[PDB]
Coordinates of C-alpha atoms and ligand atoms in Angstrom, one line a residue:
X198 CA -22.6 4.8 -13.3
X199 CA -25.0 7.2 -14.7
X200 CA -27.4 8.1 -17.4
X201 CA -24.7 9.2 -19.7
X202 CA -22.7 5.9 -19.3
X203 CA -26.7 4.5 -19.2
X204 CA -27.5 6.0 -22.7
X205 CA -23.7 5.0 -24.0
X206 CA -24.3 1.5 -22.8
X207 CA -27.8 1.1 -25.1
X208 CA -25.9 2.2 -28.0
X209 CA -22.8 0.1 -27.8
X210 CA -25.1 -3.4 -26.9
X211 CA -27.0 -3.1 -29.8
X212 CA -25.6 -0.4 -32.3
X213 CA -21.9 -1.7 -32.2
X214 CA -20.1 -4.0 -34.4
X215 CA -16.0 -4.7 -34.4
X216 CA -14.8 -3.9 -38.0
X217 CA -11.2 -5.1 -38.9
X218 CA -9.2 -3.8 -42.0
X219 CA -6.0 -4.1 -43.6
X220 CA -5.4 -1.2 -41.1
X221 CA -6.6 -2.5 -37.6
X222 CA -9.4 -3.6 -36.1
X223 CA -12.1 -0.2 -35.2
X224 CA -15.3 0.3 -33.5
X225 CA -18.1 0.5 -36.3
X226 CA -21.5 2.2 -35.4
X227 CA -24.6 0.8 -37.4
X228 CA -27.0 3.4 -37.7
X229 CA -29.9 1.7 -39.6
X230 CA -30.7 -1.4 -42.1
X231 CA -27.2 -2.4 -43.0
X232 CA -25.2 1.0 -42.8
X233 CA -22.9 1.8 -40.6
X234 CA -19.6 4.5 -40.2
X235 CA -15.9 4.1 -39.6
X236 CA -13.2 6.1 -39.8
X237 CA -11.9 6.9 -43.6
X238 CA -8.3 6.7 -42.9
X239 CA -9.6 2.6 -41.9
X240 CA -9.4 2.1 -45.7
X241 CA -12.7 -0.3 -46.1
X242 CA -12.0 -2.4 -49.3
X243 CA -14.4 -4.8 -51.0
X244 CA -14.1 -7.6 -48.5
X245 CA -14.5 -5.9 -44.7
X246 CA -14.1 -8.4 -40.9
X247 CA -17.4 -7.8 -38.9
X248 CA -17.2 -9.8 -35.4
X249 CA -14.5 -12.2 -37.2
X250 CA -17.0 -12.9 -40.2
X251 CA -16.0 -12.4 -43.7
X252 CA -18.7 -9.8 -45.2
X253 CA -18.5 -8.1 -48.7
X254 CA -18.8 -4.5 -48.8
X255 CA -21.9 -3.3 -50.7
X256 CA -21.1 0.4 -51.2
X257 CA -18.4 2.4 -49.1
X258 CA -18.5 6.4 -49.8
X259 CA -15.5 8.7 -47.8
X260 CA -18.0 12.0 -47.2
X261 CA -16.5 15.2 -47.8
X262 CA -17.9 18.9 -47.1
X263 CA -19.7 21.5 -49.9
X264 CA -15.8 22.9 -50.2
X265 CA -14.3 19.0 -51.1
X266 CA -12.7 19.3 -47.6
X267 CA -12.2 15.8 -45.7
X268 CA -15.0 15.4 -43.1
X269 CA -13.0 11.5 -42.2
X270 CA -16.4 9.9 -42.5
X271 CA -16.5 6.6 -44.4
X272 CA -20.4 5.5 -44.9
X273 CA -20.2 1.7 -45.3
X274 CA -23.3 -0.7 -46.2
X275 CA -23.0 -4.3 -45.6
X276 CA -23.9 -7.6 -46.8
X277 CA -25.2 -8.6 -43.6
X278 CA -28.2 -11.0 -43.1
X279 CA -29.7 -8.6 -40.1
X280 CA -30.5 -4.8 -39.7
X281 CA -29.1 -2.4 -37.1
X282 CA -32.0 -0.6 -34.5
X283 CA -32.5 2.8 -36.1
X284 CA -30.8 5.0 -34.2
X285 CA -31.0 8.4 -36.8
X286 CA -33.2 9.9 -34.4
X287 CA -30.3 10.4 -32.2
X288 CA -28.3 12.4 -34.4
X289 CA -28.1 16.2 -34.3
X290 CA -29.5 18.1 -37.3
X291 CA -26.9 21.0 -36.8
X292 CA -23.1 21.5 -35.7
X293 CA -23.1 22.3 -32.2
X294 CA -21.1 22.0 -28.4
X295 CA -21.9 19.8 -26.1
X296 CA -21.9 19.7 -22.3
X297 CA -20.8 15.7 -20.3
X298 CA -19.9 13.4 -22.9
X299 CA -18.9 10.0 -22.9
X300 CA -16.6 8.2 -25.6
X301 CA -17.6 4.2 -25.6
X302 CA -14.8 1.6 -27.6
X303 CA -15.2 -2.0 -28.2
X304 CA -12.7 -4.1 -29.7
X305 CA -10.8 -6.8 -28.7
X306 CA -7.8 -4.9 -27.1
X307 CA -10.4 -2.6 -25.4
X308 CA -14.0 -4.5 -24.2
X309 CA -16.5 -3.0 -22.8
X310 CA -14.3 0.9 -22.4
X311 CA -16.5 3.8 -21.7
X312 CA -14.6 7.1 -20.7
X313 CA -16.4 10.5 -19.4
X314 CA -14.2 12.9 -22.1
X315 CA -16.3 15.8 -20.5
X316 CA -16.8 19.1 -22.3
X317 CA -17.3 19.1 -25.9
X318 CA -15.9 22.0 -28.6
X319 CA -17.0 22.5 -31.8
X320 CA -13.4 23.1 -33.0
X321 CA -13.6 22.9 -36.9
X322 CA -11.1 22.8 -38.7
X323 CA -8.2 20.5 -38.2
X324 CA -5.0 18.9 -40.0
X325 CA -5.7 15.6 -39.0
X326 CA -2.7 13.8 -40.1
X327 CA -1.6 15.8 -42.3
X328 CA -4.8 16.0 -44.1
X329 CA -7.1 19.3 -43.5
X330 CA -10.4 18.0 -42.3
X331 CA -14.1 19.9 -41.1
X332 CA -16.8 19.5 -38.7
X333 CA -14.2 18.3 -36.0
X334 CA -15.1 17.9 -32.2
X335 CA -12.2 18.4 -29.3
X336 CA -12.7 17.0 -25.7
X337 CA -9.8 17.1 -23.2
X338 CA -9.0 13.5 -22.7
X339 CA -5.5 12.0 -23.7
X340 CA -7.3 8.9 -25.8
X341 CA -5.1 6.5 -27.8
X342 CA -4.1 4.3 -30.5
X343 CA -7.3 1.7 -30.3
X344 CA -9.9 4.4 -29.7
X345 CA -10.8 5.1 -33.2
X346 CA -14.5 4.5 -34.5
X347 CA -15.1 5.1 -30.5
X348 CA -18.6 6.9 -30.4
X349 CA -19.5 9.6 -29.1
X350 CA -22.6 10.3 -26.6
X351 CA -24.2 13.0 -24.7
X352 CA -27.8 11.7 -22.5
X353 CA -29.8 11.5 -26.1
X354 CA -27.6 12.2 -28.9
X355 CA -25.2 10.2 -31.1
X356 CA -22.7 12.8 -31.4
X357 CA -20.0 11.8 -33.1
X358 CA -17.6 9.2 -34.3
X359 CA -13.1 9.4 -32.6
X360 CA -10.7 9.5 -35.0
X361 CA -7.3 10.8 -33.9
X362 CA -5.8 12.7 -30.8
X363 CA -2.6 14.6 -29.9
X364 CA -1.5 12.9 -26.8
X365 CA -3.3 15.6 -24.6
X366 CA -7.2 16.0 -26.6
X367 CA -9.0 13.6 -28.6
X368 CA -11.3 14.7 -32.1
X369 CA -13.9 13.3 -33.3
X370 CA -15.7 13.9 -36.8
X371 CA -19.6 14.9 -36.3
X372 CA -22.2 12.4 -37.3
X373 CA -25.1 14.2 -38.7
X374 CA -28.7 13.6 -39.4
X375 CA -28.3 14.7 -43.3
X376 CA -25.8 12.3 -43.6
X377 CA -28.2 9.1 -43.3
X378 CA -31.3 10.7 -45.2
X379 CA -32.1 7.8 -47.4
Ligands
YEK41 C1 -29.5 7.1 -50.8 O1 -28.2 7.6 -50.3 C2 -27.4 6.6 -49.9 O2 -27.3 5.5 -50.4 C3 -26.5 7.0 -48.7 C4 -25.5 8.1 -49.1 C5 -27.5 7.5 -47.6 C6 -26.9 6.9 -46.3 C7 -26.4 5.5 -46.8 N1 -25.9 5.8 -48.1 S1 -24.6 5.0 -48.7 C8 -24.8 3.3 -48.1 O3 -23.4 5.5 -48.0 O4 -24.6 5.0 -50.1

């Protein structure tokens, strides 16, 4: 409807895959070559689902911070026979706040979903399931089982990656430039 939803809409078409694990099927961002990011608690194995093809995992690393803390960031490369558009020019150097963002899922319970979540916090530090995780982002949407993987926008900037909620905000876990240095 916009250039938010505009900017969303260029990364989902080209940067968006549908992952499925022994845990569900998620929204994976590709970022470049054959990496992409999902969720850790999706539990990627050897073997992973992308768009319904059987693909073998080549490496899978579940980030955590400088202080072993969760950061709920699993870094995935693919035996895949095409590269992803680089997109690491869209992702933030630093942790920040953000102002108008959108949160875009597609699998196949949710096609083509793009939601204006609005403000964005840098909250920090949050027991996310039970497990105490960093670098977490907060917007004031009520999101839902299905929205995990979603990504996060702003006009220009890959922001972030959903990965739980509490019925009344949604978090996400930062995606950050440092993390895709190569
Ligand atoms: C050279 O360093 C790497 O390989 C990193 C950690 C950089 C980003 C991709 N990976 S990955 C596939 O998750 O291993």
């Amino acid at each position: 409807m916009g250039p938010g939803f505009d900017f969303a809409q260029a990364i989902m078409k080209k940067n968006t895959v549908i992952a499925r694990t022994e845990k569900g099927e998620f929204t994976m961002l590709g970022v470049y070559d054959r990496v992409a990011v999902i969720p850790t608690h999706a539990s990627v194995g050897e073997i992973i689902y992308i768009n319904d093809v059987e693909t073998r995992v080549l490496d899978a690393c579940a980030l955590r911070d400088l202080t072993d803390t969760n950061l709920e960031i699993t870094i995935v490369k693919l035996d895949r026979n095409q590269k992803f558009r680089d997109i690491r020019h869209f992702l933030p150097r630093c942790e920040d706040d953000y102002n108008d963002a959108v949160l875009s899922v597609h699998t196949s319970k949710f096609p083509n979903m793009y939601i204006p979540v609005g403000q964005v916090t840098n909250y920090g530090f949050l027991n996310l399931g039970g497990t105490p995780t960093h670098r977490i982002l907060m917007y004031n949407f009520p999101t839902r089982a299905g929205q995990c993987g979603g990504v996060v926008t702003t006009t220009g900037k890959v922001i972030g990656i959903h990965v739980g909620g509490n019925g009344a905000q949604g978090f996400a876990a930062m995606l950050l430039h440092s993390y895709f240095t190569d």
